[PDB]
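Hello again,

I reread your note about wanting to compare the complex against the isolated chains. To keep things tidy I'm splitting this into two emails, and this first one only covers the full assembly. Below are the input lines as submitted, including protein chains and any nucleic acid or small-molecule components. They are followed by the predicted structure of everything together. The single-chain runs will come separately.
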Amino acid sequence: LREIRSYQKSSELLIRKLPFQRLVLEIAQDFKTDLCFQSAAIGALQEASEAYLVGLFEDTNLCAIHAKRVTIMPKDTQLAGYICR
Amino acid sequence: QKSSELLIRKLPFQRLVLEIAQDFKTDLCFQSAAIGALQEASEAYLVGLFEDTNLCAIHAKRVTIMPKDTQLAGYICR
Amino acid sequence: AKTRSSRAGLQFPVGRVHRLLRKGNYSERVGAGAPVYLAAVLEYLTAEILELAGNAARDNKKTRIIPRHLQLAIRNDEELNKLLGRVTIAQGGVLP
Amino acid sequence: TRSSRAGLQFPVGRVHRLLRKGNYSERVGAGAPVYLAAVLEYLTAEILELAGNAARDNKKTRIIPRHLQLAIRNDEELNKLLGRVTIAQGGVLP
Amino acid sequence: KVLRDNIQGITKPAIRRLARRGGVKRISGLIYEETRGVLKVFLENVIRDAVTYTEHAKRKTVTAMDVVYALKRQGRTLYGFG
Amino acid sequence: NIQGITKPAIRRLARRGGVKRISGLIYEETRGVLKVFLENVIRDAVTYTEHAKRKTVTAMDVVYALKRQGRTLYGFG
Amino acid sequence: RKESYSIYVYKVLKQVHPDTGISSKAMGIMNSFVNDIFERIASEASRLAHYNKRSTITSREVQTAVRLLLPGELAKHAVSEGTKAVTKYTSS
Amino acid sequence: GRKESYSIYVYKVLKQVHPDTGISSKAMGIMNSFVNDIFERIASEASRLAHYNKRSTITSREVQTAVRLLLPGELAKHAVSEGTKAVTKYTSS
DNA sequence: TATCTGACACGTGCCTGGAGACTAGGGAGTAATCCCCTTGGCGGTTAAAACGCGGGGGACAGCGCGTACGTGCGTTTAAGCGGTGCTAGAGCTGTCTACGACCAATTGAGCGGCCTCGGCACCGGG
DNA sequence: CCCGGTGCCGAGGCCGCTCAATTGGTCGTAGACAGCTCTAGCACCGCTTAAACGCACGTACGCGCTGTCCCCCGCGTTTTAACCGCCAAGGGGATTACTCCCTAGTCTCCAGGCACGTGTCAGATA
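Full-complex prediction:
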């Protein structure tokens, strides 16, 4: 609750930068070797991914609340992904 | 399900469409094809809605869809 | 063969595609090979979807394809379904 | 100018150069850029009104992304318009 | 000629058949009114856009293509009507 | 590689998303989901880039890729 | 050499909230938002033109496109001010 | 009043694939609308690519990249293969 | 199950979109250069994360009771067919002309640097 | 932290260079308007019967409750790499200039496409 209010109040990014950058680069390497990413583009992916993720958890929480539970579960995320399409 | 024959009655649906349009701008005509297209779109949309509502109901371990389910589906559809 | 489609061994009308591209104001100029490529893609996709439609009709022992069959094919194939998952088919019905 | 002719702050000429360049149509009507510029002015005015209100409520004289995010998400119509929109550093509604 | 409350024209058995096609088995009574509301909202939205299209084209007759375009606005592309 | 998304990071994310209690499997599921989402966005961005015959993905590349996903991103020129 | 709407957004800011500033980061958001809305309306109007097989994007096209993209009351005010400005431009 | 449609070509492709199979008018109409829809979507994407790269012409390259974007993985790959093959075949003559 | 049939398939006739040749120009391919951002590597701090433990709030199961929904039967309503008759409006063509495209010529608005200044936070003492 | 002064640095004002907006005029034609025409829609009328409405019933499901058991949360402690700032260099994005090559445009030529007229079998009709 306190953490919920604290984080929802601010707009600082949550995922540590360098790890996320390494993730993005790993995926890109999987697609096509020796690509380069501007720090700006990695930041853009950071923002988009974090916002998307946040929305996903919002929907998952809605589903869990609907199911009378309080603890989200993989089932909830499956449902949120499915309905939204 | 096995078939595709329309499910909402034609004429009542037509009168519904006309009534709705009456609140936007009077004396508009509708090609029978337009009415048919609207009916098909509504049928598909409602079938999708009920599929999602059924998913939600199963999720809640219930069997009887309830308006709460519909609301949930509409909302998660963003 | 004077017709470009014949030149490319495609049943679709290359010339019509080119005319549409120019007339549809998608760009100022239209590459010579661009209509060719696009027509090839369109013919491929139509052939693909019709493959599954005909197979479904065979399963239904029907010589003629109908919207029911197209709906079936689109919904059953994962890829097409992803491509056309946001679509509605006249008298399409839905998968059981 | 032309914007002056219409009392709009937005660049009529700029909008006109864009309508032509972006190949949205063979030709472009004379009043079309005027109308479109006015519309853009109105929409930005509404966004900025709400942002300034939020900043005042937040005791800040300089607007920042979070303020825009709040303004957008709070107003029903705008939220409807920008529902698919994610704002850099936007944050989320409390 | 006047019109009235034709929303009820979507009778309970109609909605029940709809849901059945959707795979639903058991339906609460409260559903019917809610579904009627949702359908009304959906039609309001689509018809608003279709009528706008027509008005722009200086016509008095909503044509199927107009509804098709309106649906496309909603992102619900429709086939089989041109 | 992917596991760089620390459990606590997901916890913070969900907190911003309003969640209050989270099951253990949530972490792995979220990791996979985000992996898929990125895979998609980066595929599209890399394609945009390759078409431009460039070797360096650019912020605009990602912006368009998200635009295709119905994910308009504001604040990147 | 690059374009933007930043300065005009700033002028609007002074028009509406004389005593308020905006972060460059926020000005970027404002600029991209204007670009997005402009592009949406423009493409919408282009389709209106092609759809009725006219080659001219006249004010009428933009009016209907706005009436389509925006929600109800926002559209009402938008069309109001747009038509108003168009009239004035013709007046002078 | 002449009016365009791909019904003839769709019918031809049907003969190619399921030669012993007919098609209803409604199904043909659906196919016609489907072809128009994808044609339009690919053309729009190609146009946006052109204008993104500040290039004034839609060449084969743009359509290729557009197909790679719109279509899903396996379909995209197969279509790209088919398209490049057809372009090569055409340029050969 | 004929049969018929009209829905698909088939011929023919027209013609209109498509195709080929030539031109010219500007648009795109190429290279050459400039220089910036990108990576990469290190060391230092330290906040961030990783791990363990304890308990307890919450998920899950089971049970019991009530009741709202599915089923059926009988009764009622209007949806559908046709059918028939009228015309408002779509569509198509023909005419004119007001409006937009090009371009030549001029001007100051915008762009970017330059400076400067205090609002909001840095900074250095309480 | 506060706290007044710093400062700094992002806002904000100013400067000057300018190149894109403005303006004029011309010419073309897209678009406006009108006239005709012919369907496609509307209504209305009667009829039929299929569908819908309502009643009654009972029972399967929702819902509340309990009661367990255990999976997360919070805390503490220990480990880590994320961030940092620097610096080095170098790959490639940006910019420009130049060439040739492709495509719009035209004329000109004609045959596949499409409509319309016609035959005939897969499936609907009988």
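For quick reference: The beta strands of chain E are 26-27, 61-62, 78-79.

B.
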